[PDB]
Amino acid sequence: HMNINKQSPIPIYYQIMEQLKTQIKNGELQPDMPLPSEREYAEQFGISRMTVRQALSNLVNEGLLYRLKGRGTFVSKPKMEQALQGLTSFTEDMKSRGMTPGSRLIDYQLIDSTEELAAILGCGHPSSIHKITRVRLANDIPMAIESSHIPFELAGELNESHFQSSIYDHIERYNSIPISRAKQELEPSAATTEEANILGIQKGAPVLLIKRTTYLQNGTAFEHAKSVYRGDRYTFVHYMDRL
Amino acid sequence: HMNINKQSPIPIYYQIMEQLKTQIKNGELQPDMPLPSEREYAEQFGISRMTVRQALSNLVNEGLLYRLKGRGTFVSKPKMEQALQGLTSFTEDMKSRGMTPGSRLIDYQLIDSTEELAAILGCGHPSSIHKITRVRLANDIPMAIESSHIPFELAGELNESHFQSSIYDHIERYNSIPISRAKQELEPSAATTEEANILGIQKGAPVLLIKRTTYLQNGTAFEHAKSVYRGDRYTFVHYMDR
Ligand SMILES: N[C@@H]1[C@@H](O)[C@H](O)[C@@H](COP(=O)(O)O)O[C@@H]1O
Ligand SMILES: N[C@@H]1[C@@H](O)[C@H](O)[C@@H](COP(=O)(O)O)O[C@@H]1O
């Protein structure tokens, strides 16, 4: 199934870890069928069982796999439940679940309003708009890519210390008005080459494409954001009623 | 670029229609850009413009393309906005959009409860559970595949006429109580070969996978459902507050 090249300078255990990772990334491994045994892998490739064991144990310690006594070794399927109706920040979302939020700046641009953005935000035109594009990390694992358009006057000058923490925190502080309401539009999608590369997932893997338009308590729109969320680590939850 | 085969029994305009359809299907030509002109198509394939015009006009009449004056012909992107917070039936969703809801039965089985299903539904074990798997149609265009699990006692015996109609309407009538509340779980997915073939979309095309547990006004769960919705024809909407 996988491919081991003994002539390569990459150690065999490392090859196994990487190829199993690539297999989980590619969907090639069912999540609750057991992995091939140490024996099966070792015989298949003509390598030591201890080499196989080294790889599998490392993967367990990285949480990508888990052992069930008497049943074998299984692919981990960690998925966070994300509530759709509570208006929150990524930073709030992560801290609530005891994980450390982070960000890496993909791109920052101050841009001229378009008439389309101006219609969405109800902001001036012509005006200047922050365009803040970040990958959002949970314990240094990329979870999403978000591109947030915010009218300049609702945020003022921004620097790397804003980008590396919570934009919503800054928005409330800077405007002295809390964040109160949003509208979101959800669409399933396949990760583009670039999205996959930044997210560490396979090209074309399932992502949820989300557009959010977010409002201050005085009813001013301060954000129009377009984001892609990793399908493989998220479950989006909401409720419904007749009203 | 398309592949026109003039030795084929299939008429050229029909090829153009089908290959354009396939191209839209496979997301191969941008929805914001205008198609190549009548002339460009004709000159590329060494065919008559009138053949091209026949194919494009047909596709306009089918609503797959549209003509913007002076700018060109464009790929239509019919989106239907689906509100996530309002508990409704497919039948209700369509009617309120002035469209005709239909269903095609994929499979019906009356099945034994499992400890897993009984936990979800709070139903009896062992008991019988309806398992109703249908294609849901909007004016004869497939929109979703749904597999609904419903405890026998909350629905009684069902036949093909129930399947072709609204299950939710039956449920409220049978139980003399309104359908009141639900929890849904959402995740994006790629359409399986089977899901794609039934939905008329490309293998691997984006779909929304949705699990619904649905409750009657008295707190009784009556449905556990697993569905896939075509990503291309839906926009799911909800609101948020603090
Ligand atoms: N999907 C939203 C984004 O639309 C928003 O821009 C972000 C701000 O998060 P933070 O305040 O941590 O910068 O929160 C969520 O993730
Ligand atoms: N997603 C829901 C399904 O979970 C539900 O089973 C169906 C019933 O629709 P109907 O009453 O038309 O049969 O409505 C929607 O489509």
Numbering used by the authors:
A (entry chain A): 0 to 242
B (entry chain B): 0 to 241
Manuscript text:
In NagR and the entire GntR/HutC subfamily the C-terminal effector-binding domain adopts a so-called UTRA domain fold (Pfam family: PF07702) that is structurally homologous to the enzyme chorismate lyase.
The crystal structures of the complexes between NagR and GlcN-6-P as well as NagR and GlcNAc-6-P were solved at 2.1 and 2 Å, respectively. The two complexes crystallized isomorphously and their asymmetric unit contains one entire NagR homodimer. GlcN-6-P and GlcNAc-6-P are bound to NagR in an α-anomeric configuration. Each phosphate group is coordinated by the N-termini of helices αE1 (Thr90) and αE5 (Ser165, Ile166 and Tyr167) as well as by residues Arg133 and Arg135 presented by β-strand βE2. Whereas the acetyl component of GlcNAc-6-P is indirectly contacted by Ile209 and Ser226, the resulting additional space in the binding pocket in the case of GlcN-6-P is filled by a water molecule and an adjacent ethylene glycol (EDO) molecule from the cryoprotectant solution. However, upon binding of GlcN-6-P and GlcNAc-6-P, the DBDs are displaced even further by an additional 25 Å. This newly formed beta-strand β* appears to lock the DBD in the observed ‘upward’ positioning.
